[PDB]
Structure formats: C-alpha cells, structure tokens
RNA sequence: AUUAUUUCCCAUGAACGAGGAAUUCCCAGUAAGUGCGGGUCAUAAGCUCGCGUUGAUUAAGUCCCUGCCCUUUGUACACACCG
RNA sequence: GCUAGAGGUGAAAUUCUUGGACCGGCGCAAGACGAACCAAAGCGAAAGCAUUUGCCAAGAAUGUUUUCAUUAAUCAAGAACGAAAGUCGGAGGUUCGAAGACGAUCAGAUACCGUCGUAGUUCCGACCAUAAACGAUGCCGACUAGCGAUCCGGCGGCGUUAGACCCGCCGAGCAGCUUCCGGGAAACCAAAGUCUUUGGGUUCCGGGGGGAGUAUGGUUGCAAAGCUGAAACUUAAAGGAA
C-alpha cells in the first residue's frame, strides 16, 4: 500500500536522523 | 417466600372535574406496615392517560398526565401534571416538502402552576399548487413563532390551571395559532404538542377539593 | 409440446400466398394439395404443414395474418373498408370556440361566422398537474 | 381488586423487544407497582434464544395467568425497542408477545410505542467504519 | 473511470455535509450518500392483526404504525439487499420502483 | 365451531417452497357469500368440494 | 483343480427380527417382483447387455436444497482464480 | 416497585447480578449532541455551516434615469484562513475510543467480533498547515442549442385564499435532461465546445516507468513533521479508456 510505504518511509527517516545525531 | 401482592389494597383513580369519566383506574399499593404509609406510595404516581378514555368522545392521540396529590378512603385524586401527543401522532404530522415551525414558552398562569407549553406547525400546501415542496423563509418561519409565542402566552398568563386545560382538551389553544398563522403561511397542523409543568405551589386540599366538585 | 417449427410455419405460409384458393378448413382436403403442390420429403412433416395451414385458413377467414400476404385478398379488404356516414362529422349545427381562437379568425377574413359559438374562457391555469 | 359484571381492571404492559432478549413487563395503570415480569430468558435454555418469537410466546402466556389472578383483564401496549443511538426496530418477540396476550383471554387497548429516541444520540458504539463483521 | 456523474451522493454545489451512522453497522455515512428509507409498517403485522382486534376493548380502534426513518450505508444496503447493481443505462433510472 | 363445506370455485396457483400447497379461492355452499382463499395440500381442480375444520381466518 | 473350476448327495445350521448419521434410482406396462437369452465360456454368472412375465403407490408441481445455463455487474485476471 | 437472571454473539465467553443486576416509576446531576423536518435545496474564499431568542459587524444577488470615471484582469515575492489527527498549557472528561488488557474465532490474530479502557474526543489560549483539501476539471471575458424544474430578487397577469397558491418574463445561482452544436483515445463533456480553418488575457504546473518526494543543503516547528529538492544506478514498458 502506498500509504504504509509511506510510514515506512517516515520510521526510516527518524532512524537516520537519530542515527546521523549520534555521530553530530 | 410469602406473596406480596396478598399485602397489596386496590386504590381507586379519580380524574378531575374537567372531565366526565372519572373513575379513570385502579391502582395498588402495599399496606400500612410499620411507617411506610400507603398514601406515601400513591402521592407521587402520574398516570398517563388517553383523552380518549377522558371526559366524552375527544380525541385518542392527546395524552394528560395526572398526578395522585392527596388519597381520600380508597379512592386516590389526580390533578393536571403534564399533555403530550401520541408517538404515532406527532410521527406522522412530520412530513416531507414542508417545514414545521416549533415554539415552547415558560410561562405561569394565575394561581402559580409555571407551565412549558410546546407548540408545533406544518405548513399546508394548498388545493391548487403545483410546487412539491411549500417552505416558509426563515422571517416568515420567525412570525409564525412569534405568533405562537405572543398566543400561548396570552391564552395562559390571563387563566388558572382548571381553565388552561379546558383550552386543552379541545385543541383551542392551537387553532387559534393557525387562523392568526394563515396571512403569514398557511398551517394545518397546529397543536400544543407538549405541556410541562415546571413549578407548582404549595398543595393545598381546599383547591383539590374544588378541583374535583 | 406443441409448437412448429420454423420449417413448418414457412412452408405452410408460402403455400397459403401461392395456392390459396385450393385450400380451405380441412385437414384431409388440404393434405393431398401441399402433396402435389408441394414435395415434402416427410411424410409426418407434410401432415404437420397442411395441419398449421388448416389453421392458418380458420384465421384467414376471420381476418388478415400478419404473416400472409396476398393481393386478392389485401385488395379486397380495403375495398369493402370505403365506409362513410349519412352525414360528415365535421360540418355541424354549431361549433364551440375558444375566445382566443375567435380571435384568431378575426384576423383572418373570417371575422363573424354564425357557425361559431364563443364559449365561457375558464378560470383558473390550473393545466398543470402537480409534482412530486 | 373490587370490580363488577366483569369491567375491565386495565394495566400497563410494557413490552421491551429487543435482539438479544424480550421484556414482558405489566405494570399497574401508573407503572410504579410491578404485576409480573417475564423475559425470553428465563423461558429459554439457550441464550441465542432469548429473543426469538417463541421465547416471547411463553413469556406473555407466563405473564398473562399471573394477570387472571389479580384481576387484570386489560393490559395498555408500551413497546419500546433499544431506545438511544441503538436499533429503532422492535426485536422478533415484539408482535409474538403480543399476540400471545390476547390468545390468552386478555384483552388489550391502547397500544403505543414508547421507543425513546434523541432529540440527537451521542456517539454511538463502533468506529467510523462500524461493525465490520 | 467515474461510474456516477453525482459520485454516488446528492451534494451539489456544497462543501460539507455532517454524516450519520448506518443501521446495521453504525459507521459514518454522509446524510446525501447515506441510502435512506423511510419505512412506515403497522405495530401489529397481518399473522397477529385478527387476534389483537377481536380482543380490543373499543369497538374501533386501529392499530398504530411504526414511524421509522432507516439509514444504510452502501454496503449494507446492498447485502441487505435494498439497492441492487444495475445495468449501465440502467442505473441513470432515478424513479423509486413501483 | 361447525365444520363448514366448502366448493372450489377458482384455483389461483401454487404456493409453498416446493410448490407443495395449491392456492384456491373456496367459497361457502350455504350461501354465496364467503369466497375465501384457502391453502390446499394435494391434487385440487375447479368443482371440488373441501372440508373447513376452521373457516375464521383466511391465511 | 491343492489355495476346495464348476456340479450332485448326506451332514454341519452362523450372523440376520427392516437396519444409525447419511444416501441412491424412478412418473406407466414405468418402479418393483419373477425367470429366460446373449456377451465372457474347454469348465462358467451373484456381473453386464437384452427379453418377456406379473404389475403398482405417488406426482401433471416448485427454486426450498443440490447441480449447471443465461442476463446484469465487478476485475490489476487473458497461461484466464489451478489466475 | 416486582423479580433471577441480564449484557453480548454466527454460537459463546470475559463482564454485570448471591441477591437487588436487567425492567418499570418519580426525580436529580454532569458532559456531549441538535434527530425526524433535511432536499442532487441554501450560504461561505475554501475548510466548513442546522434548537430558541437577543446582540455584533459583515455579504452576494436584485432594484436604480444615484455617484466616481478606467480606478481594471491575473499574479513572483509576501500574507490571511485552512477538516481530521497530532503538539503544549488550563478547564472538563457523558458517550465513544488509538494504545493496552481480557474474552472469542483461527493452524497462527499481535486482526476482523465481544467486554473494558489510556491518550483522544469537549472547552479556552498558543502551535501545526497537511487530506481522494475532488467537480481528481485555475481565474476573468466573449460567443455557440432546446426543455422542464429549482433558490433569491424584481416585474405584470385570470382566478382562489387570509402574504399563500396559480401563469409568464428578466437578472443571479445549485443542478437535471434531450440533441449528430462541436470536441475527445474513449468513457463522457452546453463545456472538457468555438483547435493543423492552430494566437482574448494571465498564473501555477507536466516531459517513459523506477530510484524518490529518497540523499544532501537551506528554511519552518516544542515535537511530529512542513516547504524547497538531487544524482548514481536500474528498466521496455508503466499507464489511460474501451
Ligand atoms: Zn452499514
């Protein structure tokens, strides 16, 4: 669906930022 | 274990005087045992009932409430306690291609019962028209209102409670509303849907009496 | 179960529009003329079409088959259709007229005809029937 | 109760027709004092039952002898069904409890729904998609 | 494709309409998508109506009716089988059946 | 109540699930009032004359 | 011919007292009973294909079930839902 | 008040009742909501908007032989508003109900179904600025058919009724239908027409399908996220209507 690829998308998101913050 | 109903007396449910038929029921309380007195159960009963089986011939989808305010050997008074239409009734005057104009007004009459009378009005399509649909505008909808507002006050701030509901049993507090309604939008079904009794004052067994001579 | 088939109501019809005057209401009369006029392989197939033309005769007698067409016969019935009374419809004593319609002869040279009668114009455009 | 010639002594029966269950509740003229109250439940084993028209049959007949012995011959129809935002319908036990009192000698008057409907329901059970069964 | 020149609901020239909840399932439904019927059916059917007559205590008293307005929404309608699916050229047939 | 005779006059069709009940207006031989319809279980035809146990209902 | 090919004689005399849930066939010389013939066949019918004999009950109806057919409808299927 | 069951389901159980649940009566309190009337009807820039009454300041259309006299149209930048959900701080939390628990169903349900129930749903203030925010159809203007209805205003006509109705016309608007106006890939469209017989004005915006509304940079926000927005690489189809 196009609208949970959506939501995966945004957890995907916040891990590589959380992800990027880490090494900030 | 042991049969209630066999510690039960059948009291007698007398209507007021603005009726013929009287004897309207029977009800049934239990006996006077330690300090629940029987009077205590019948003094706040409200009996709902047709006004079909009220005073002669009247009509079958106008109900009056009647309250049991004070039992006298075996036979309980009523007084007036409340009017409303029959489901059936008020379900079928609600058609479609029409509005329907609804008042209510807070007002007492002379001797201190504050009634809530609820008036309701349908505009009627007349003989010749060939509209499917015969809607008021909203100020000529307001005029009805106002009408039904300045007529349900007058024809009740002026009387007591014995003659406000020899204006009810007939519908003349409504069909006053619809001849004034007619130079505004015709009506056809103009009735006084709905009387609450808010307030009442002290009881007293001289105008219950008088109530029922 | 008893309906014809197409080949027999066909057959039974061509036969009627070709040789209808050999044929008439009975079966055994009309069995031998569709057997010479007509060579059916079957023996139970010609009795089932000089059957259906037995019938098909009853309705000729009575009226016209939307299937048969003959010209005697067409002729004939349009012919004897020349029907008409001792007096026309049209030309009567008195003749009712519209007020606007009187109006519309009085622009025309036929302005005051004693033949016309001006009815009383009613009241009301009430023509439409209601909605809903 | 003190009656002559047989005059009708009316009551009020008040008939709860539900889907999962059907109330036969007479109650005197007022309707504070209970006569008898008997449901499809405690006429029925199962209780897929207890609102099946033949729950209600045996459910106004139980009701309908209680009434013979106190001399209620009469009964006033108060038929409600499921009130609030819930179905308007009666259940399948309403017009069977029904006839199940007059086939028992009783007679009836005054019949009247008494359903209470909003004047607007608040939000009724089940998501904005509903029951998805 | 757009099967209905209406979408399937009479809002004409209208932003928002408050919805209502379906009878069988009490989902939200727009009040113009819902597929409304207003059923009026007597209190006491034909199988009872002889029995409850000849024990009436009035000499003619007729048996109220049931004032019910029904609300279905477009799948239940049709498993309820109120709406059918129609023809192509038949669906643009906007008289209720007789 | 008497057991009343009746005399089919008219068969309309066939009712039930399996086509089982015939659906025929009987009407009364002691008058010609009462043309009642009945349900009637069997091999019926127009002339036969059946026996109403109960004539009240029409059903 | 032993694992008895069939057949005859004497003896042996078992379950089975109309049969659960289910399920089959059938509308007139039909069902069913009854025997005969053909096929198989050196030996040969509890099978099957035919034949006559005796001869009914019920039904002349319905979509309820179970089967397919058609129309409408939907499809991202077209190796076509075993998609 | 009378009673042992009520709730719920396809069927049940969890749950409510060892007694006073459910049911009936008279009441009371709180918080939501504004049924039927209610419509292919109205209004508003959209989102959105329905009990009564009062108040506040706006608005289209119509009417005008009033006034001003080109003051206009569309719009980068910029700005107001912007459903629901969400966020923060207060008030309130009836119903409903993410999460969660438990009871069913199933091979498994962490789902559908049932009993509860947190956040939420309600109100006030401050954020957010996204919807299948859809008529999947920019705004302004002209022109090119017909018909019956409908909403508002105006106009003149039999008649009925005490403004209502009836019959037309004009302007404005929501729609409907019939047509070989024409257009289109067609469905369909009085506009989606007046288009190879191509140009009324103007804004935004699309360039095979993926990668991808991803990476990075900037910006906005308390946050969630909003806005702007690639490439390498991969692919011969993806897709529309019928
Ligand atoms: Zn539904």
């Known amino acids: 669906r196009a609208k949970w690829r959506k939501k995966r998308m945004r957890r995907l998101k916040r891990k590589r930022r959380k992800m990027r913050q880490r090494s900030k | 274990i042991v049969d209630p109903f066999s510690k039960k007396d059948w009291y007698d449910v007398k209507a007021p005087a603005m009726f013929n038929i009287r004897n309207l029921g029977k009800t049934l309380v239990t006996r006077t045992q330690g300090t629940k007195i029987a009077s205590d159960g019948l003094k706040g009963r409200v009996f709902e009932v047709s006004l079909a089986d009220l005073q002669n011939d009247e009509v079958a989808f106008r109900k009056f409430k009647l309250i049991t305010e004070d039992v006298q050997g075996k036979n309980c008074l009523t007084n007036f306690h409340g009017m409303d239409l029959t489901r059936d009734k008020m379900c079928s005057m609600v058609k479609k291609w029409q509005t329907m104009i609804e008042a209510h007004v807070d007002v007492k009459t002379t001797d201190g019962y504050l009634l809530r009378l609820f008036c309701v009005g349908f505009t009627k399509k007349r003989n010749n028209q060939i509209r499917k649909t015969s809607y008021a505008q909203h100020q000529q909808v307001r005029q009805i209102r106002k009408k039904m507002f300045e007529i349900m006050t007058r024809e009740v701030q002026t009387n007591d409670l014995k003659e406000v509901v020899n204006k009810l049993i007939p519908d003349s507090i409504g069909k006053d509303i619809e001849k004034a309604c007619q130079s505004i939008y015709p009506l056809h079904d103009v009735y006084v849907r709905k009387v609450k009794m808010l307030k009442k004052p002290k009881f007293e067994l001289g105008k219950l009496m008088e109530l029922h001579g | 179960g008893r309906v014809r088939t197409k080949t027999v109501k066909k057959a039974a019809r061509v036969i009627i529009e070709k040789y209808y ?84 002869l009085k622009l025309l040279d036929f302005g005051g005809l004693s033949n016309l009668q001006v009815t009383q114009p009613t009241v009301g455009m009430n023509f439409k029937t209601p909605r809903g | 109760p003190q009656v002559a010639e047989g005059e009708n002594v009316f009551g009020v029966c008040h008939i709860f027709a539900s889907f999962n269950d059907t109330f036969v509740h007479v109650t005197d003229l007022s309707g504070k004092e209970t006569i008898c109250r008997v449901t499809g439940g405690m006429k029925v084993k199962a209780d897929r039952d207890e609102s099946s028209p033949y729950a209600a049959m045996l459910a106004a007949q139980d009701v309908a002898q209680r009434c013979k012995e106190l001399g209620i011959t009469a009964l006033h129809i108060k038929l409600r069904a499921t009130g609030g935002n819930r179905t308007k319908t009666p259940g399948p036990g309403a017009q069977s409890a029904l006839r199940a009192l007059a086939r028992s000698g009783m007679k009836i008057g005054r019949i009247e729904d008494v359903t209470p409907i909003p004047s607007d329901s608040t939000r009724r059970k089940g998501g904005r998609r509903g029951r998805r069964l | 494709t757009k099967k209905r020149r209406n979408n399937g609901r009479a809002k004409k020239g209208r932003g928002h309409v408050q919805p209502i909840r379906c009878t069988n399932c009490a989902r939200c439904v727009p009040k113009d998508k819902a597929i409304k019927k207003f059923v009026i059916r007597n209190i006491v059917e034909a199988a009872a109506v002889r029995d409850i007559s000849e024990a009436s205590v009035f000499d003619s008293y007729a048996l109220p009716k049931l004032y019910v307005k029904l609300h279905y929404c477009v799948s239940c309608a049709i498993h309820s089988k109120v709406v059918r699916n129609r023809s192509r050229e038949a669906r643009k047939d906007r008289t209720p059946p007789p | 109540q008497p057991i009343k005779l009746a005399r089919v006059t008219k068969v309309l069709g066939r009712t039930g699930s399996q086509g089982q009940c015939t659906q025929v207006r009987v009407e009364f031989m002691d008058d010609s009032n009462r043309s009642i319809i009945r349900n009637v279980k069997g091999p019926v035809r127009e002339g036969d004359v059946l026996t109403l146990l109960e004539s009240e209902r029409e059903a």
């Open chain 3, 21 to 104: 005057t050999r044929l008439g209401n009975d079966f055994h009369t009309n069995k031998r003329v569709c057997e010479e006029i007509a060579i059916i392989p079957s023996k139970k197939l010609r009795n089932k079409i000089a059957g259906y033309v037995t019938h098909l005769m009853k309705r000729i007698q009575r009226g016209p088959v939307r299937g048969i067409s003959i010209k005697l016969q067409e002729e004939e019935r349009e012919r004897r259709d020349n029907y008409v009374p001792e007096v026309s419809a049209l030309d009567q004593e008195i003749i009712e007229v519209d007020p606007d319609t009187k109006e519309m």
